[PDB]
């Protein structure tokens, strides 16, 4: 997962 | 079907909280919306349910306390109230890009209780595709469609059975895949023993002075610690 | 599997439009007018403006409007035997548009039973399915008179409720899948409360003015709007 | 499929006509008289004018009238055994038209059961289709006495309501497809409930006035004079 | 299945009345027991039902007003009350032969409602064999056997259906073959909507002063014209 | 087809007869006695005369009587266990007729169930049909005790009423087709309702009078002396 | 087919007998005693005489008596567990008859269910048929306690009434075919209703009198002295 | 299937009584718990039912009045209340060996009504193995499990049928094998069971608390009279005067 | 299928008690939670049920009075309330290792009443695998899921039947394998006659002064001895 | 033709 | 249609 | 076969 | 297919 | 049977 | 044999  | 208490401790060590956006609210909840659990929010109109749902739709993607890395959200909408533009404003407040926020939320409308249960089976399948991706499941609202599809008397047996089945499935989803399940509900809180038992945390929301709101632990003694004051802005729930 | 991202849903909602009521204050009350991807319900007593509003929207839905609204066609299901093209002629005269063109862009059907009404709505769905973007508005005047008619005796209420819920879920799906506004009228005396996205109470004001209000909303001025009725329809 | 344009529907309604009741005030109350493509229901107690109105319309429907109405034939379904051609004789005398012509232009049938009444209405639909513009009025005196007769005990109400709805929907279709006025009489207890209220496009309560005068009112309408009309009953039928 | 109003007028011109034996009763009935119609008489014990039945059994054979030529009678007896000797006494009163009177009355007992309906089907056949011979059908009484055969509730639906079917058959018989139908009934009047609708004329019989009786139009206002006084003698129904 | 002229019916009724009750006043009350082509029902409390009347008719039906009555045989169906030939012996003694002849002209059967009672009545119908005019009296003491017994709980009342109506219509047809008098006794609570009221052509209430006298009255009739009669009970019957 | 002449029936009834109760007044009340070709039912409260009457008849039925009664044997079906031969010993002592002969001439059976009671009555019918004229009295103490037991809840009342009617018609046929007296005891609430009222030819109400005396009355009879009788109870039985 | 009255008299001559441990209670019962019969004891908590059960468990093994020789006992326990240590204390009171007392009592728990009926069928078999060995059958309690297994209405017909069948079996066991049957029962006051249990029991005893530590036994549904009542005491040695 | 009273005495000599952590509570219970029996605890919120469950989860593993050797525990959780960290705190109080405590407790969630019964069948199998290892079965709570799955009336008969079956299985498990069964229950105590009979010991818990709690024997006379005072701490139930 | 009695 | 006259 | 009444005095 | 708005006068 | 003496 | 937890 890549934070926004 | 049995684990040792040691294995269950190892399982619970991965439990996380998703911040509500309000420090006082988080303290009330012990850190925020808790994983491996269902949290139910009920109250009257303009008490904060939709604002809280959207704020959690944003905050669940943000790295947080206790090593929370952020993740994806599933939103089931029985009320036709989901509005991405609120997520845009909240993302602006939290200094994150709109499109990225909108890409990490999967959304579905439910139009009947049978449809809602089928959607929740698809949610289970989606979690099964790859664990650790999703952290939060939102259902706004949890049983409006059960009130809609079985309004006359005499059909209560099947209504209660379907409701219990859905809520046991929700519990199993929350605990097997280590996700927080947040649901909204109406008042008349409805659901009776079934919903009371199924929800691990229940929150009453009401209006305070001016624009403030108050969250309280349902059926708890009249004491300040069981209450929290929060505010609503274009940026969502806050202190 | 039936799921979209919030981004795709945002892209879908960006196509939402409003159809003017003919009254500026009423439009402000509604946030621009009758909204697509939603059901708007109007209820009140006799001569409060339901039929006048239905006919005015029958005309205004064909006109270019704010936000790049290009106009489109209308379907009108009539359970009350109240549709009158001459009202549309007068309103077209007011808005300086040709009568026959206005009348050619409205499709019309009478419903005589609730089962007939649901079949008609299935034909409406098929018609919308034929080509998207052609139709913008579905009017049902009125939404559930036939359900009161066909199941009046006690003991049949369960089936009544089931059929009503089914119809209203279909109407929701129609409104949201085909991006049309659905406007329905209703009488006064959970299913209908839930199904409607916007609910408007209509009542008489001083003289010839009428008042529109958000149902079950606080007693505050912003939730009310004053409008007038003329031979040219709804206006300021 | 199954839909018309508003233009076509306007063209269809342009052929709508009214049949005078014989009373100016009554016609004004009705917007010209008994309207085609619609059901008008008259209910009241005994000697309020239902039968006099039926016979008067049996005569006036054959007369040229306002709006280019050329006159035509009538079908009368009688569940009460009350139709009396002699009244038509007196009414024709009043309106100065020949007796035998009036009597030859009215078709008549008794209905003894609700199933029989529905079969009769199917024959009527076929006859009206046979050649449009000949018949202008269908009278049913009365509309649902036989439905009360055939299902009087409780528990059979579902089938009663279903049959009644079916008959009334068929009557609506007959009136609107074949451009005829449908006039029906009804009893009070008005019976029928929501079904008959919805099916009828116009509902008239008839009651006794001063002396020999009668009163017509729009049912379920506000208590106001405009929604009421005074008329008289004579050997010549309904009049001012 | 339809007639012109002219044809129906021609058919109704053949309607006749059978005198009850009482002038005031006849005035009450518009001339007497009317053909193409059902007349129902109900009351308590010894009010005149059986005397009226027998008197009509005799008077239907006598030439009368309006060119009435007389004719034959059919009598269906569910109560075991028919007594030819009463007819003998009434014939004596009217100075007519006994054996001729007795030869012109056909008689049958009914022991069940199904039997009663079969008998009515035979009656329809007999009337059809040659029209104009029979003028009067008497049923004493109309629905005692339906009370008997369907006394427990739960079978009420079938009772009402059979009763309606029988009464519609009676109506069709009376109107198709131009006969008067006279029936007696008990009180508790029973029948409900079905019997109220089926009967064209309803008569309540009660005791008057001394040995006199009173006949009244049922459900009519309390007014003298709706009532008639008559007397009962060994010679049957007569004037006071 | 199934119809008679009034003349034929008059000829049929000319053969109607009456069986004396043993009491002149009772006979006047009945128009001569127990009438043929009809059912006569007698009901009352205990010791009002029902059993005495049954036995007296059991004897008087065998005797030549008024109106050319020649006498004949009797059938007695007993649901109450009350029939006692010795009463017939005493009544025969009173009327100066032989005991054994009286006893030979009465056929007797007990009924233990309503179905049994109806089967017995079918045999009675067959016997009457074998040769009309032989039997003049059918006694049923009592008419529907066994129907009360076999259908005492509610919910089976419909079947009770249907069976009762069927039996009573059969009784009517038997009485009128074969020109026999049917005499039945009944209890009070009179039971039967509309069915038994309609089925019976004559209904008699029996009650106790002054001293040892009894009173018979026409049921549901006005309160007038002509509708009542006084009679006495002795070892010789009514 | 199924009919007798009145003469044959008279000849059959001439063989009817009465069994003395032990009390002169009771016997007068009954027209001589317990009558054959009939059922006599005795009901009352506790200690009114039902069991004493049963045992006294158990003894008196064996003694030659009035009207040419020759004496005979007795069958006793006991549903209450109340039969005690020692009472018969005391009554035999009173009447100056041998104990062992009395005890040998009474056949005895307990009934534990209504089906058992009916089977026992079928065996009784068989025994009577084995040789007629030997047995003169059948006692059932009590007649329908077991029907109350086996059908106590409503909804099974139809079957209870049907079985009761069948049993009572069988009892009637037994009494009338073999010319025996049938004596039965019954409880009060008398139970059974129309069925038992019709089936019994004689019904006796027993109640307590002054001191140690008892009173027997004809059930449903007018309030008159002739319909009542006073009797006493002693170690020697009914007197 | 029939006996002569003489044979039945000979059979009844074998009836015996088992002392309750209380003289007044025994007088109330005509000597004690009677054979060829069912005796039912019902009452509220701490009225003496369990103490009476255990005392009879001991006294049934002791020679007694009327030529009673003593014998063995069968105990079916639906309440989980049987405690051998009470029998040890009562044996001490009556000066008899503990292990001998415990060896002469056969014991089984019942967990369902069907199980209880199967157990009673085994009891019938055991009695049949050799008659005259066992003198007392105790069921504590008689129909708690029928209340449990059929608590909702609509199954009441089957409950009543099973209960009647069990009680008729108990009667037949008591009368065929000449054993006393003692059962305990709850109250709801009036005892449960209705007509079925009232008829099935030959003797019915209501137990209630008296003054201080005393208890009172009464004949159920009997007139309010002293003779129909008895006072007794409860000690570590069981039921006593 | 029968044992002698001697054999049963020998079997009961193996009965043990598990200390609650409170001396007064233990005295109230005759030593503590008793084996071969079901003990039910019911009360309002924050009365001690969960604290008691966890304390017993720890104390059942410790050697104790009367030669109690300690053993393993099975915990079926219908309320989502089991928290190993409480066991960690109680182990700290009693000076025993955390991981050893956590390894000797087997744990399972139940989501339906049918699931709960299947779990109890697995428990029976596990106990059978090797007897004498497990000493305590905890069910928190006993019939919440039966309330949930049968909330509408008309299905109450089946609910009661399933409940009775489960409780009879629990009794047989406790008595065959000599284990103590401790269950928690809600109030409205619910269950009716079935649960009242099935439980050998019933405890009402209520709040005392300040932070103290009071345990009482249900349906017992109003006397102090039938009551006990105890305290709740991070270390569990205590004095 | 009907024959009237006379 | 012919009007009556 | 005839029944013998008991008698011993 | 494009929608044609009505427009005359 | 031997009494448990 | 069961091993009691002990670290103390």
Residue numbers in the entry:
A (entry chain O): 2406 to 2409
B (entry chain B), I (entry chain A): 84 to 271, 287 to 337
C (entry chain C): 83 to 271, 291 to 337
D (entry chain D): 83 to 271, 287 to 337
E (entry chain E): 84 to 271, 287 to 338
F (entry chain F): 83 to 271, 287 to 335
G (entry chain G): 83 to 271, 287 to 336
H (entry chain H): 84 to 271, 285 to 337
What does the paper say about this structure?
BRCA2 is essential for DNA repair by homologous recombination in mitosis and meiosis. BRCA2’s BRC repeats bind and disrupt RAD51 and DMC1 filaments, whereas its PhePP motifs bind recombinases and stabilise their nucleoprotein filaments. Whilst Ex14 and Ex27 share an eponymous FxPP motif, their sequences are otherwise divergent, and they demonstrate specificity for DMC1- and RAD51-binding, respectively.
Hence, we established a crystallisation system for the structural core of human DMC1 in which its N-terminal domain was deleted (herein referred to as DMC1 ΔN; amino-acids 83–340). Whilst soaking substantially reduced crystal quality, we obtained X-ray diffraction data to anisotropic resolution limits of 3.40–5.80 Å, in which additional peptide density was clearly observed. Nevertheless, we were able to build the BRCA2 Ex14 structure guided by an AlphaFold2 model of the same BRCA2 Ex14 sequence bound to a DMC1 ΔN dimer. This resulted in a refined model of the peptide at seven out of the eight DMC1 protomers, with more extensive structural information at instances away from rather than at crystal lattice contacts. The PhePP-binding site of DMC1 is formed by two loops, corresponding to amino-acids 147-153 and 178-183, respectively.
